[PDB]
Amino acid sequence: AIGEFMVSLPRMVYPQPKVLTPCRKDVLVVTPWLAPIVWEGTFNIDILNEQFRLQNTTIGLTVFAIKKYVAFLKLFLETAEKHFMVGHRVHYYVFTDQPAAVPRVTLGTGRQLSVLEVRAYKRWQDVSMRRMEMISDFCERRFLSEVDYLVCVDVDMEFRDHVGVEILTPLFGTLHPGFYGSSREAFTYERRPQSQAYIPKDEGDFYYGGAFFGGSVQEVQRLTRACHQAMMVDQANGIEAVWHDESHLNKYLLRHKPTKVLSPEYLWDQQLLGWPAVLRKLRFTAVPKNHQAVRNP
Amino acid sequence: AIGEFMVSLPRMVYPQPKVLTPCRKDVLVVTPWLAPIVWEGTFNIDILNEQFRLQNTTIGLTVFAIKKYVAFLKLFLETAEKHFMVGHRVHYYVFTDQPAAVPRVTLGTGRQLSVLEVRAYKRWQDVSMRRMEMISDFCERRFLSEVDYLVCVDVDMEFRDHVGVEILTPLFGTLHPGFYGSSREAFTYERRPQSQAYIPKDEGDFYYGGAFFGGSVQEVQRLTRACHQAMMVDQANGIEAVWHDESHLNKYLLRHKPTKVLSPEYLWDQQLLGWPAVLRKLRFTAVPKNHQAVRNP
Ligand SMILES: CCCCCCCCO[C@@H]1O[C@H](CO)[C@H](O)[C@H](O)[C@H]1O[C@@H]1O[C@@H](C)[C@@H](O)[C@@H](O)[C@@H]1O
Ligand SMILES: CCCCCCCCO[C@@H]1O[C@H](CO)[C@H](O)[C@H](O)[C@H]1O[C@@H]1O[C@@H](C)[C@@H](O)[C@@H](O)[C@@H]1O
Ligand SMILES: O=c1ccn([C@@H]2O[C@H](COP(=O)(O)OP(=O)(O)O)[C@@H](O)[C@H]2O)c(=O)[nH]1
Ligand SMILES: O=c1ccn([C@@H]2O[C@H](COP(=O)(O)OP(=O)(O)O)[C@@H](O)[C@H]2O)c(=O)[nH]1
Ligand SMILES: [Mn+2]
Ligand SMILES: [Mn+2]
């Protein structure tokens, strides 16, 4: 459940926080709207685990595995078992056009998997974009009754290190690995004024990755609903945003500030971008793929 | 109101946050439980003002002016008018044993003051401690149906700089100005295990000042009820905590982590402590007083 009130912790022994020592001297750890930016070194996971366990927190994890992308599920789920929310209640939701192709994966106690059969769109752009509509629909159909928080990710990925309750908050986005160090004019926002996802060169906080966002079920429902509606308006106007659902996610989070922002520890591609010193851990990373081959028959 | 969901902001022009530049290099700006620690340089007040105005936020401010402390009201209120939550709805609650002695203070638009008549205790310790009971009682009688957040402060103080919506959150405490750089072993927590306020030497995050705390009405009601109840247990057991209400406030916030922590900018004494480099602003500060003279006939 999401408790309405602060919870009471038992006695705990851990190092005292140091007021006169910054937890990181190399990165921004809070946004100008006072949302934590989650980097290793900023959180004590034992405290957070207590707070969230005391509320019997249940986390849904949504993933789409349409057409050839069912091949990514085995490694995705096996690594999630090792690294994602261990110790907490987890409900995986695998959206797929091929229920029988979902691999058998042994789950830890308190963890379960639902397969949600959905239609496959022809264009990969549509498959990716229609995730917003499908997530929104199932929030009403299933998620509101079943989980407290939703975490919505790409399937062509693997967990390599801890991804836990430190990310949970009403609404979160994740710094895109290609742009965390970029100025807002280099951000690949949709720049056509006619698009609902339009963002001018003098606006923008961060470039958030479409591959990892989430929040309470109610906030994720609103975000996904609003993004879908924006895409439908664009469609009616003959427009498709440069980066599809990610463009609309960025517009949404520009205007509705997330209450936490995850660092690129949470969304990385090691082959493409290496391992900068600023990343103490690589938690959730790309799996090599041949885009053209895997996206088409 | 305290909106259920994130609000939508209009277009805004402000400097882009810099992921690879820490906002402060000299202080901790986030706790190990991912609560912001509020210092100048961590927040953009324009973004926060928009967020809270869109919710039509009403902030209540409680202050006790019992016996000779009515003398502090004029400067307290006149400076609050210049610096506290300007632009937002404010409801001052002045608890006093002398309603007729409350000074006439001119208020800006959207701001109101209520005088709550309460009993005077003989001992200054009891006057200070009974604030918990009194705030708790009025949370139910009045604050629940009248304001969104409550801010509870000492009266022997003046505002010298901005104190605004950046502090608002479900539950906040403030770093005591005397001890922000101290190790936990040095904190003047209650150390007798016979007291409900007991905290052993290997526990403690910060030493919070009893002169400035707050949060949602519901969280403040819980904190103040719990502190009063603990004080009554100690009294039945023949013990009074070393620092009275502050000792209990500290035990409470140790076990129920605050969702923001305010830096000593928000609670200072310049005569005692000067103006250290770590304080870029001095926002709410002690008015000199002769403790013995003002606390007794
Ligand atoms: C100034 C920096 C210039 C260099 C930026 C380098 C990374 C670009 O990244 C792409 O960025 C797009 C938005 O602009 C989409 O998010 C796309 O999905 C993403 O590629 C995906 O994520 C990537 C991390 C890779 O895994 C790629 O294979 C994926 O297709
Ligand atoms: C290692 C540092 C050694 C030096 C510490 C110097 C500040 C001490 O502070 C007192 O601390 C107490 C708890 O231990 C109570 O909070 C007391 O109300 C407070 O004095 C109040 O607040 C102070 C800021 C002053 O305004 C004082 O006049 C007040 O009575
Ligand atoms: O044929 C497809 C194309 C994409 N997707 C889903 O849409 C996500 C985003 O697509 P992709 O990973 O190819 O985008 P990229 O990361 O390269 O931008 C994938 O992770 C899958 O979950 C899918 O299931 N089948
Ligand atoms: O005779 C008194 C003593 C205490 N107080 C209230 O209790 C608060 C805390 O007492 P005080 O400021 O004297 O404590 P200190 O800050 O010195 O520790 C004061 O700000 C007043 O609001 C009061 O109204 N009358
Ligand atoms: Mn992907
Ligand atoms: Mn005082």
Read off the CATH number of the domain in which B111 is found.
3.90.550.10
Pairwise CA distance, residues B217 & A28, whole Å? 32
CA distances from B91 to A79, B23, B148 (A): 53, 33, 10
Does ligand 4 come within 6 angstroms of the Cβ of B262? Answer: no
Residues 6+ apart with CB under 8 A from B292: none
CA distances from A201 to A183, A191, B15, B210 (A): 10, 8, 12, 46
Contacts of B213 in chain A (CB under 8 A): none
- Which atom of ligand 1 lies nearest, measured to the CA of A286? 26
Pairwise CA distance, residues B8 & A257, whole Å? 8
Ligand nearest to the CA of A269: 1
- Give bridge partners of residue A173 from the DSSP assignment: A261
CA max distance for chain A = 60
Q: Which of B2, B14, B16 to mutate to test the interface with A (most CBs of A within 10 A)?
A: B16
Counting Cβ atoms within 10 Å, is residue A104 exposed (0-12), middle (13-18) or buried (19+)?
exposed
Q: Give the residue numbers spanning the domain of B161.
A: 1-297
Contacts of A32 in chain B (CB under 8 A): 14, 17, 23, 42-44, 47
**A246 contacts A200 by C-beta, under 8 angstroms:** no
A227 closest CA partner among A128, A88, A150, A93 = A128
Going by their DSSP bridges, the two strands A157-159 and A284-286 should be labelled as antiparallel
**A29 contacts A42 by C-beta, under 8 angstroms:** yes
Q: How far is the CA of A185 from the centre of ligand 3 (A)?
A: 26
Catalytic residue among A166, A190, A240, A246: A246
On the CB side of B63, how many CA atoms lie within 13 Å of its CA? 24
Looking at residue B187, the DSSP 8-state letter turns out to be: S
- Give bridge partners of residue A91 from the DSSP assignment: A60, A112
The whole-angstrom distance between residue B250's C-alpha and the CA centroid of its chain comes to 13
**Ligand 1 pocket: which of A127, A129, A157, A243 to mutate (most atoms <8 Å of CB)?**
A243
**Ligand 4 pocket: which of B62, B124, B287 to mutate (most atoms <8 Å of CB)?**
B124
Does ligand 3 come within 6 angstroms of the Cβ of A37? Answer: no
Looking at residue A261, the DSSP 8-state letter turns out to be: E
Cα dihedral B102→B218→A172→A275 (10° resolution):
80
| Crossing angle for the helix pair B244-255 and B217-236, to the nearest 10 degrees | 120
Helices (H) and strands (E) in chain B, counts: 8, 10
**HEC string of A8-68?**
CCCCCCCCCCCCCCCCCCCCCCECCCCCEEECCCCCCHHHHHHHHHCCCCEEEEEEECCHH
Pairwise CA distance, residues B241 & B222, whole Å? 20
**A107 contacts A113 by C-beta, under 8 angstroms:** yes
Pairwise CA distance, residues A221 & A209, whole Å? 18
- B226: phi then psi, degrees, rounded to nearest 5: -65, -40
**Angle, alpha carbons A151-A17-A265 (nearest 5°):** 30
Pairwise CA distance, residues B113 & B89, whole Å? 11
Number of domains in chain B: 1
**A146 contacts A112 by C-beta, under 8 angstroms:** no
Ligand nearest to the CA of B209: 2
CB atoms within 10 A of CB A292: 8
Helix extents (H) in B57-116: 73-83
B283 closest CA partner among B271, B269, B266 = B266
The structure was resolved to a resolution in Å of 1.8
The whole-angstrom distance between residue B27's C-alpha and the CA centroid of its chain comes to 21
Q: Is B65 known as a binding-site position?
A: yes
Q: Which of B2, B8, B12, B19 to mutate to test the interface with A (most CBs of A within 10 A)?
A: B19
Instruction: Give the minimum alpha-carbon distance from A86 to chain B in angstroms, rounded to a whole number.
Output: 18
- What 3-state class would DSSP assign to B90? strand
Q: Ligand 5 (ion): which residues have CB within 5 A? A: A 154, 156
- A84: phi then psi, degrees, rounded to nearest 5: -100, 110
Helix extents (H) in A41-150: 45-53, 73-83, 124-138, 144-146
What is the count of residue pairs from A and B with beta carbons less than 8 Å apart? 164
Pairwise CA distance, residues B141 & A17, whole Å? 38
What residue type is assigned to position B130 of the chain? R
Ligand nearest to the CA of A285: 1
Give one word for B256, left, alpha or beta, with left for phi > 0 and alpha for psi -120 to 50.
beta
Does ligand 4 come within 6 angstroms of the Cβ of B52? Answer: no
**Angle, alpha carbons B87-B90-B94 (nearest 5°):** 145
Exposure string (b/e) for A263-281, b if CB count within 10 Å is 16 or more?
A: bbbbbbbeeeeeeeebbeb
Q: Is A133 a known active-site residue?
A: no
CA distances from A25 to A42, A174, A268 (A): 11, 20, 22
